[PDB]
Design a protein around this nucleic acid. Sequence first.
RNA 1: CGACG
RNA 2: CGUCG
DNA 3: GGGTATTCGCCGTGAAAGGG
DNA 4: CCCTTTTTATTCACGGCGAATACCC
Lengths: 1292, 49, 48, 586
Amino acid sequence: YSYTEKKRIRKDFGKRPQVLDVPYLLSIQLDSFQKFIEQDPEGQYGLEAAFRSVFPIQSYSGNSELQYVSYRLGEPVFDVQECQIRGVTYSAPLRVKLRLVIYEREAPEGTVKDIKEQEVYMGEIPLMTDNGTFVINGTERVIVSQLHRSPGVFFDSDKGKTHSSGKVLYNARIIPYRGSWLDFEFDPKDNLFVRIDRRRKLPATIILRALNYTTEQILDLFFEKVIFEIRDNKLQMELVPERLRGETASFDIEANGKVYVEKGRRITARHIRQLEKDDVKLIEVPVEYIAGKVVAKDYIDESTGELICAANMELSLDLLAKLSQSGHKRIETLFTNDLDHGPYISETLRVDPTNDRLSALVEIYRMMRPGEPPTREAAESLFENLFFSEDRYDLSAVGRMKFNRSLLREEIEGSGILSKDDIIDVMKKLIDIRNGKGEVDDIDHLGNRRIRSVGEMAENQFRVGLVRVERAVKERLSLGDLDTLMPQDMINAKPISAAVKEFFGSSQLSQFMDQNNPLSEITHKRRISALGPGGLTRERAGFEVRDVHPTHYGRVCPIETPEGPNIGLINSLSVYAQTNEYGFLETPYRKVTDGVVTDEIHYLSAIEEGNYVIAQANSNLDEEGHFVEDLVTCRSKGESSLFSRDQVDYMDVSTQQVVSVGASLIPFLEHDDANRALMGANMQRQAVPTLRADKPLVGTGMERAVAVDSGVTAVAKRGGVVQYVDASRIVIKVNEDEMYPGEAGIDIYNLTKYTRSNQNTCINQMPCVSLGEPVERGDVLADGPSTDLGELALGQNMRVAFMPWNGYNFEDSILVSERVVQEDRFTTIHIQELACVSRDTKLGPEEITADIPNVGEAALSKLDESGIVYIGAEVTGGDILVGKVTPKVKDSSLRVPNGVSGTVIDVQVFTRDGVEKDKRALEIEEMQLKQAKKDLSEELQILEAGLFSRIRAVLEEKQNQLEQLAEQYDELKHEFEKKLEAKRRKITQGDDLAPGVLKIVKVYLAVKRRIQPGDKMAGRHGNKGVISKINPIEDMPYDENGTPVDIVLNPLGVPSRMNIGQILETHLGMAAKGIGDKINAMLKQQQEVAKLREFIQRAYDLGADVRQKVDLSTFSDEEVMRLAENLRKGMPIATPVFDGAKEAEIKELLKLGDLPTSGQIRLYDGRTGEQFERPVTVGYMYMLKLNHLVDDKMHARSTGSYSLVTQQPLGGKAQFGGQRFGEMEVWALEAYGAAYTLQEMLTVKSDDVNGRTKMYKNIVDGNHQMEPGMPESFNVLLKEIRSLGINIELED
Amino acid sequence: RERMGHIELASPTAHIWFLKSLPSRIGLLLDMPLRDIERVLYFESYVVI
Amino acid sequence: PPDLRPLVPLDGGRFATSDLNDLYRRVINRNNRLKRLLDLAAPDIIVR
Amino acid sequence: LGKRVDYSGRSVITVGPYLRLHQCGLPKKMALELFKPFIYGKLELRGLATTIKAAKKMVEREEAVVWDILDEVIREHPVLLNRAPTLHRLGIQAFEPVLIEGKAIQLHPLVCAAYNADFDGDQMAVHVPLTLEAQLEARALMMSTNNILSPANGEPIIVPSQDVVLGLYYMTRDCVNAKGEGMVLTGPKEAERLYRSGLASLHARVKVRITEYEKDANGELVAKTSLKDTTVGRAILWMIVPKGLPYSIVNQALGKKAISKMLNTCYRILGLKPTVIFADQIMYTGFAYAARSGASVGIDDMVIPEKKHEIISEAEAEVAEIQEQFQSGLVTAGERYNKVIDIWAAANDRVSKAMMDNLQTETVINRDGQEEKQVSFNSIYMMADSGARGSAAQIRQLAGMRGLMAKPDGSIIETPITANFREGLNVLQYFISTHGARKGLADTALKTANSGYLTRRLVDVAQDLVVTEDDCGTHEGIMMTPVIEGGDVKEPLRDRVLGRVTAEDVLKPGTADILVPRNTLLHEQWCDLLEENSVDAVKVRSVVSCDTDFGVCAHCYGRDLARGHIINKGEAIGVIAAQSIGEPGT
RNA sequence: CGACG
RNA sequence: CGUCG
DNA sequence: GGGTATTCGCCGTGAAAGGG
DNA sequence: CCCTTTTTATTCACGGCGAATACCC
Ligand SMILES: [Mg+2]
Ligand SMILES: [Zn+2]
């Protein structure tokens, strides 16, 4: 085990061993930006594909070529720790190298005159940190992914939703990556129409005539040609045995003396078998079958040159008589059917007079541009750049792959441009669906949805910026002069900077990250939202879009969705779920070869899951890779069925593959309902870190992955020993085998102390290692917020009993004792931010100088000679912190709002280059330079001692070595002075501000919020509720030992809501506390070591084939006492979500710790002091605290400010406003009488600016009488309707 | 709050609430469909007076 | 009236104003452009 | 229509079980903020402050002088409590607030069934009336003691939800053997003394001497003394029951509907004044005995039937045999799927019946020699049988198998969930349940907005109908009769014509005489004669067949289902009708 | 005017 | 129903 | 010579920014 | 404080009401 696991071993109850380790949870955010940053020689992904899509460019009649050479990212002057406290954007400059050449005259491939190569800077791109965040304006920002539809071709349908008839209607839809859509819909009248970008209707012959196709090159593709020949008597057609099945007998079918089908006889298999056996070619057809066919090709004459008839006409008797008497030997037609084929092309050709390509182009230009008149050349250019241009219509490799996979093509590579045969193959696939031999697809399948990360959205925004820059330089180079000045200032970096500031700033997917919990940060980073730019609308969603498809096994967690307006669209990614190359999702599966489960894994996509059969993870093995049972449940194509032993092809990896990392931390997940687990997973994300976060007794084991995967703790980069322990920094000296020959030496880890998060929650990192402790790589060093020795510690645990206690737990309420208040458990520190902006002001600018009027004599004792409040003074809401004067004397001092009272802990002063503070910012700069000097002195004292040891060990070869080390010491002191000057220029540099401000001071207040009746506390199973009354200690129930119960819950929610996993969690916590009390009983008195080690070995060997298998014989005598100290408060239990502990193991753990089997001990009353008639279920449960404090909800207003557009009070808590009296409250008042109640509600309290003052004066003088008055909102409405051309007045 | 102002118009214009009222008031008062009123108001065709 | 359309002077790089005041300013601008156009004996298509 | 108001607040609701029905709990800071001009006027009239500015400086400095002045203004001044979703008239009620310590409002548990507000972090708004007429309208019309009936039907809305009904079910129950069985007592006070002393049990068959009062005479109440075999808990609860009710309402099982029928009988016999004290005394006794009960859940309370695995084995054998018969080529799949789902439904019903028979009969207690079988004292069975919290289907899904989980597209999978919530589950028995849960959550999240839009459309249709007349006189009407769908009855004759004036005389099929006059009200005594005569159809005046111009009269409507008398003139009944229609639409 | 519960 | 700009 | 059934669209609710 | 030219082209459910082509006597 590692050094962290040897401090406290968490007992596991899993019966099945794991084969694949849990990977990095932030891999979907880190690898995409890593591929976006680095360069690739193929130019497929990253900035190379964005620069290759624009470059090279060529101007018309200019002979100027601006090509691409290379590029290189720059280093920022500020790190991550400085932009979070300064306010600047953490970004890096982009350095690109271009080359502009010029050709000669009348030579397109001539020689050059001169080369123009330089280094051009185009904008600063924001760099991603190691945690996956972006510092835009001093706040860490996380851009979530986007779940959109993959580019290609799909087939939708409606179940008679448009027409009143009961039938089906199919439609094809082509979705490109960047271009126009192409809809091919049907009709109930058997027609085809084309819809492009939701424009007007257009038949399919116009898009076919515009692709250089004649009439004879259309009907031969969708139908089979039938050729008639002239014989002596009873002229005949050819016969196919597979083309006369499903039609009634129209005549007497007879050939060569044997009757096949008589008159009115249905075709059976024997008649068609005899027809296939005979296969004769001379069979006659009578004359009434000729007129039912149509014309396929127009008949031309070889003697007179005159046409007989046109194309797609009706066959008549005079026409066939003229065709027989003229000499036309070949008579062509097509085949008509009702159950096998369909004459849709013949029906489409008779609903519009469009015959040639000219009228088709006129109709195209009329549908595209209804205002401009049609023409020939511009319409041809429009049809050229609609679908046959890579600059306006381009697809990626995933679009070409989905286009070729839907049309049964073996090629998965293409050019990304549409051709003429693609529409033919789409229409041929669409006809077979309507005919009956086709199948329909679905949108909700995960094989048709694609996840777009930030590395593709940033590439698209950079491509938009690059095409804007090349359009601007193309419009500039059309009239500018050449070989004049170096191409460095002609490229404007302002559109690219504006594009990346619009993308990384105000965007639908670029939202803030709530830093109230590390699990909340991990869930926000691993968030797959279907909304955003290029997706769908939340208000325009339906039933099936919010519904989850059964193909979401292992890729989407089914119990983590925000309930409310957007449920099923902001779903999270699972644990073992990984992205694909094209942008799909894949899950690992154990390969099963001839019954032997191989330990290797294979990632299968969504479309590859249904092609194979996958078994379940809950399958017993005989310790050899074989199945101990013959019949096992599997899944074939989306349903559960029983399969054999040989037919098993794959197997799941683990039981935690379906749920995410937010739902994996809930113990006993299989005993809870889906809604209760969903509410518990939603409330676990809203956890608030307490003062002393302690370990959970009943856990899962993935809390360490949440602790070490999120950047909220401090881990060791290289293994070594700890040299200096402090609350501010940690000095660790590395070992010899990991020491680089060119490195600086030891490593210094800085600890953030009392910083402000995005949710006004205090976060800090406290160290846990001792002085002189050996650590290794990957070991934790400091516990951050909600961290206990490298484990996620959300809330606290206490005694929980399920009994009704005098109605204080009626619906969902929680009765908490005073022992929780006295032990300082649920106290939370909150840090707020108060700023003061001093801008320009005419006739005296805003300053923070002395002699501020309208003050008191007590305000001078709290402020300095300047006016800034001291750090560490307890203030009250309504005092004066920053006294700012505004000459116009007018006072504009910053005051504290009522309702908050904290302590000033940090004052940040940001001054410009014009006005510099003399006593506030200068001492901050001195403290930062002193801290940096102390850090570099502590880092180089070891190197100075090593150089002193070297000069003592060394002191001609020895004289040359002495001169070598002497000049090395001179070079070391020279680079020391250079590094000191660089640090002095870096710290004392300054910053840039907005144009208009002078200086910005910020005061941080730290308020200590305790637990009070009115707060909201819950658990991990969905037992939400509030606190009613803080009960005393002597009033709470107690056992025979006298220990009072801290929290009394309500057992009425157990039959109503199906969450009984909390009862198993309470019993397991009671057993763990009994084991911890039996351990602590051997530590309160003087005991030995071997008996305690034997009891620890007995506590870790319950049996039932566990996978922990610890060995206490290898532990020394110094670590056993530390383990007993860490286990004297309770032993942590690891319980997976589906491989959890059974009830018999809980009964054995209860019997081991001298506890009863049922777990219900008899409790006595606290007030009266008598035994209850029934035993009460009492134990230990892990409770949490939500961010629904009662101090942020209570608000009251009697008199306040009003609006200016209307005479109505305001609304909210930050502004002094009142509550809203909605229309339903007016309806409820109208249900009663409430005449004078409604007269005073909306006329006296809101309107009547001269009447409410009279009402206030009447209340002051002691008169409860009001006036009706006149509402001002009705006067505003009367003035608003009179502003139009409508007159309205009042009549008397 | 009760004092108002007025803006004169050198060229006359039509109203919107009496044009797209479904049915139109001008389309009901005159013997004309709505598309010809849109053609005259958007300067597409003349009318003989 | 201007009291029904409040215009609070904000502090920043851009100016905060109402959309109805901008629409009325555009209407007055178009009316003043038409008034300047009628005083120059303009042809039919430009006044159209 | 919707404006922001002054003198209003908003906080988090709290139970506060020590309060009464006509009062609530208000914090000191909210009572000091919402009553600033009243405190200023009291300081001006008492002659303590010099001016209004001195009173403001005395208020905002947190002095101990204006604290007892608040006891004179928050004594007889009611406030208007309101929830943010409002569906009908019971969402806005009036309470007399008291001064508590904290930052939360204490909402009474008896009005939580009308407010539909649980204590999982819900918020409510409070308003302060200013006009004297507004205070008198809040006291006389919008009070919580005056609005105890539902606006849609004549049923009481003040019902014990989960805890008081569980306490009254645990206190009043029959046992076969307990401490102190077979002794006769002299009164209920001796039974309460024996229960408090510990010499006798709570659930024991004893004999007490009770005196019940009847009101068969006009002007006085007679009394009768009898000795009945009852329980000690029923003898304790008899002291809560006043003299107007007999002993037949106490000696029953006292489930959920029994307390509602007892409160309805107390309202229809005594009135409004003794009922609001009786409901508070019932709630106090239930909250007092809920701590003495000590009901808890656990692992041994959810029993498992030992014959469940045999039924599962024969069901799996039958599915395997019918699958072999399908694969042999005998029965097609379209009937085999129906046969599989039918035998799985039969096996689920057999497992549910075995689980119910194991739950209701599991405890045997001996008396003398041989043993006896009675109703079990299990906690989950006591919470499910009394109707406290949870229906029988959730207990069937908890202990026994939950059945078949259907697909959201319309179909249902032929294999059900074998294991229950007590046993372990795999990921295959947890996927379709999440599908159905997400479907139900999206369905309720869309249908609550659809119901809100429906009731918003439905209020504005009948928003201008005020009763302006008392009697008009019409000869037309509707033919009121209980409809028959084809099977048994669904709505009886008593709940269709209760409180409505008939149109003409009813013809008797037997003797053909006149029963009722034309313009008369149908109270609770004429319906007994109407069901004893066994009439077919009664010509009753309706709202549609009225003749009053611009509104209806007091006779074409009938009873307002809120009071025992007729509806007064000038009541906007259309808004109440739209609110009672739009409320259970969710 | 958008995000979140 | 609130928070933010 | 003359008219309403069927269908298909439109509306109701929940092309203009850049420098001097 | 003012003109112009090369193409930003972006996706609900259900119901009420108005308008251009047609078969039959
Ligand atoms: Mg609630
Ligand atoms: Zn009437």
